[PDB]
């Protein structure tokens, strides 16, 4: 049980967080086209 | 014997690719899988991700997280989220956001927010020492 | 007989005793130089990732004494290593200095830790979780504990500096006495005195840093 | 004389007593590795029952200890 | 008297001062300790 | 999607922690708690919400 | 005298029996750093089943003693 | 008496024996702590065995405390 | 006489082997519980393993206390 | 005698050499059950692992029963 | 003779110093299946490393029985 | 004279609680290979464990070589 | 004499010391297996750390063999 479970937190939020500060420390010459591929458009209802 | 599957949401590194060994970073500590290995299931954290080809030779990559599955057939299945050779990144955005959220964990306060603090607090950790 | 590299060694009715504790620091030269000699890069290359090893667990008061147990480790690491030539004294192998190193900066440490801190100080002699029953066998416990961690660094540096050479010193006696005997043996015997004398050189480095960690964290304990 | 005698098999038989938290006290901080391995967000709250199970490990050592020199001295 | 407490003084005295104060205590405790020792010998 | 002109409404399941944990096959599995199927799970429903997306 | 010379040696013998305690007591208390760097909210529960062994450890840790001193003092 | 004196030291050495139930008993409510931060949901299963496991052990231990008494009395 | 008194030392000692099976003991209904809590639907065949664990390490246990009576009856 | 008294000691002595394989048999035959928990597949090989490791263990502890009896006898 | 005497009592208890071998052998080929059931292709390179561990285990298990012949025949 | 004589067996029993830390230190180096197998990035910070384990192991192994040379030499 | 007997009983059980190395060292070898199974690519950096944990360990079984032999003939 990882401190963030404890915290409250789901592995889908930890996959999310880690995801994106993996996608920020991309040089810029791939930072665009992979933040493209990976951004989220859907609104819930 | 060991038919290796690693993908990612948009790229297919290996499929049903015959290897030798691989290491992965399970949330329970770090383990090399080889042929027959005992079957097992876990989930990724940030870190390095090495394969062995036959030939003796090393592909690494990098992985954020996901999940690892080997099975009773000796076939892995390695999906990670977000999967990135290594030279796709820099050491020096790494150590950058790694000081601003060890900045942003002595100035938080509260529990919640502080958890995603620390999360990508060892996001950027494991960014630094997989790189060099 | 046996002991006679113990023995406080004293040339033509002087103490040279004196002189072999002075000279460890001799091997420490200083520049006031940007870039400087060999020597002096690799010392002071080891010296920042010793001080980087001991000094970042500790706070801003702890830190403090980054001076004294570098110079500490430094200065045991050294007489230890330079103990290990041929008949040498090492004044590490007495228990009188050995006690004279671990006596003030053990006493030091929890002096300072029983100005301040008096009440963490004293409710460290009860961990926190400890039940109701248990409260009072534990305190005398810890008391016992804590008035032998001094004696237990001396002794655990004179009595294993001293078991080494000790050792080595035998096993030297039995390849002589086998010298004139069966030929391979002698080699064989040689074999384990080499071994040996690398164990001596490990132990030698990890005594030294043995002691100052456990310096160490009875300062963090008390900082 | 005989008791002079005996009390030196008697103090050191009973040291052989220390032998048990020479063995406990590995076992103690050996588990303290392991068990920092898998959760090292647990630092201090792990190495706060090592400190706990090494005094009490510890403990049985130097109750031995006393013996030893209760009978070497004190007798 | 010069170049004696101008090297050995100065550098040493934020230690000797403030930092090994505990350090002195301790190593009274330590005269003390080889005294009775060294009395009952 | 099967071809330009085909495709079928297919469905997958989606297990719950408990019958995954609780199921007599996934003994064979390895350093498995209630822990490691929780993250895994979950993960694995974003899998198949992901997959669906995509046919 | 035979009986007060024995009586060290027999007084100091069963004070190794205490050694099975310095090392069952170093198990417990390492596996406690182990089960809970696993499942750290049983904290409690845990350490409840820690103390509870830690003192079935110990109590033949303390029988050892009891024969050390019956042979010692008692007879 | 040689044979009175005899008895302390036969006496003293048996009760080492209990130094092996004072490291089983460790090992014993030691893997219980493992176990159970495993599977807490057997707690009442894993226990059972833990008292079957602490019995069997002690039981190798008594059997030392047995012959400690049958030579320091009953001869 | 030397020899009825030399029977209760070697005797005692010989006793001192049963040390080993009670800690070997603990170790078996340890990893039972350890190994039970991993994979619960084995149950039977663990405890298969562990019987003839306990078997064969308290075989080595009666072993001395074979010798603790061969000694101090039949000699 | 003398020496028909210590050979009384010294083979109860000798015999203590016996509490290793006591302890080394509860090892193999316990991680048996942890290693045949995991991957119990493989119960065939992992059981020809144990014999082999209970024989060389058992082995050590025949060695010492081979001097008590050496020096019991043969003496 | 008190010397032929003294050289059974001591060449006895040098023999006990073969339980550290009995106990270490267990525990290689123990972790041998425990390791083994883990990486089951690697069996080839694990068992290398278990004779290996026994070699050397065994090695200080014979310096032992060295001893022990040495004071009883070589002396 | 008796008193010499017993000084010997007494610095020899002493010196066998070093055994505790044979073993103790076998644990803690044996813990720091399984702790840094499943965590290699805490390399550094595992070492500072191990050492520290083992300081405080052979701490209690050297305070047997203490009374085991308090005995020979300063008695 | 009582002082050439004595030798052989205190070099006799100081040799009993080296059965903490027989044992330390089989667990060191025994977790480089279980290291080693986990994670194969750090075989290098593992065995380095065996080695270390092996000298050490041995090292506090030859100061018992230092003691046997420091007894035997030095004195």
Same mark, same amino acid.
């Given at each position: ?45 | ?132 | ?223 | 004389?005989?008791?002079? /005698? ?12 220390? /032998? ?47 013996? /030893? ?7 | ?41 | ?55």
């Amino acid at each position: 049980v990882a401190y963030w479970r404890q915290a409250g937190l789901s592995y889908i939020r930890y996959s999310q967080i880690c995801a994106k500060a993996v996608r920020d420390a991309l040089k810029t010459e791939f930072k665009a086209n992979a933040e493209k591929t990976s951004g989220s458009n859907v609104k819930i209802v | 014997q060991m038919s290796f599957t690693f993908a990612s949401p948009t790229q297919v590194f290996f499929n049903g690719a015959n290897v030798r060994q691989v290491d992965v970073p399970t949330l329970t500590g770090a383990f090399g899988i080889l042929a027959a290995h005992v079957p097992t299931l876990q989930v990724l954290r940030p870190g390095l991700v090495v394969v062995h080809a036959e030939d003796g030779t090393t592909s690494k990559y990098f992985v954020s997280s996901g999940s690892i599955a080997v099975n009773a057939d000796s076939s892995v299945q390695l999906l990670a989220e977000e999967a990135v050779t290594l030279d796709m990144l820099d050491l020096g955005a790494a150590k950058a956001n790694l000081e601003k959220a060890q900045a942003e964990l002595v100035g938080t306060a509260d529990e919640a927010t502080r958890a995603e603090i620390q999360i990508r607090i060892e996001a950027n950790e494991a960014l630094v020492k997989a790189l060099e | 007989n046996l002991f006679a590299s113990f023995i406080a060694p004293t040339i033509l009715g002087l103490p040279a005793a004196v002189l072999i504790i002075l000279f460890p620091p001799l091997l420490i030269p200083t520049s006031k130089y940007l870039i400087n000699n060999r020597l002096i890069t690799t010392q002071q290359w080891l010296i920042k990732l010793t001080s980087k090893q001991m000094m970042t667990m500790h706070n801003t008061k702890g830190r403090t004494w980054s001076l004294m147990l570098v110079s500490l480790i430094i200065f045991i690491a050294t007489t230890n290593l330079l103990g290990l030539l041929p008949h040498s004294f090492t004044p590490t192998t007495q228990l009188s200095m050995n006690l004279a190193m671990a006596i003030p900066l053990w006493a030091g440490t929890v002096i300072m830790g029983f100005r301040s801190k008096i009440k963490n100080a004293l409710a460290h002699f009860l961990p926190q979780g400890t039940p109701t029953p248990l409260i009072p066998m534990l305190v005398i416990i810890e008391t016992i504990s804590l008035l032998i961690q001094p004696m237990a660094l001396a002794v655990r540096l004179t009595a294993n500096i001293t078991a080494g050479h000790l050792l080595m010193h035998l096993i030297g006696s039995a390849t002589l006495a086998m010298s004139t005997i069966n030929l391979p043996s002698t080699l064989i015997i040689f074999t384990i005195l080499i071994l040996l004398t690398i164990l001596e050189i490990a132990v030698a480095l990890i005594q030294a840093y043995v002691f100052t960690l456990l310096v160490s964290l009875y300062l963090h304990d008390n900082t | 004389d005989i008791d002079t /005698a005996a009390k030196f098999i008697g103090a050191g038989a009973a040291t052989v007593g220390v /032998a048990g938290s020479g063995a406990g006290i590995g076992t103690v901080f050996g588990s303290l590795i392991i068990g920092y391995a898998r959760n090292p967000s647990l630092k201090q709250q792990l190495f706060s029952y090592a400190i706990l199970g090494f005094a009490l490990s510890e403990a049985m050592g130097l109750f031995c200890l006393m013996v /030893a020199f209760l009978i070497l001295f004190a007798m | 008297l010069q170049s004696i407490i101008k090297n050995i003084w100065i550098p040493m005295k934020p230690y000797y001062t403030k930092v090994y104060q505990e350090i002195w205590i301790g190593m009274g405790l330590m005269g003390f300790i080889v005294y009775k020792i060294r009395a009952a010998d | 999607f099967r071809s330009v002109i085909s495709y079928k409404t297919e469905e997958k399941p989606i297990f719950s922690l408990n019958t995954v944990a609780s199921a007599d096959s996934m003994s064979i599995y390895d350093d498995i708690d209630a822990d490691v199927l929780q993250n895994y799970q979950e993960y694995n429903l974003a899998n198949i919400i992901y997959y669906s997306l995509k046919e």
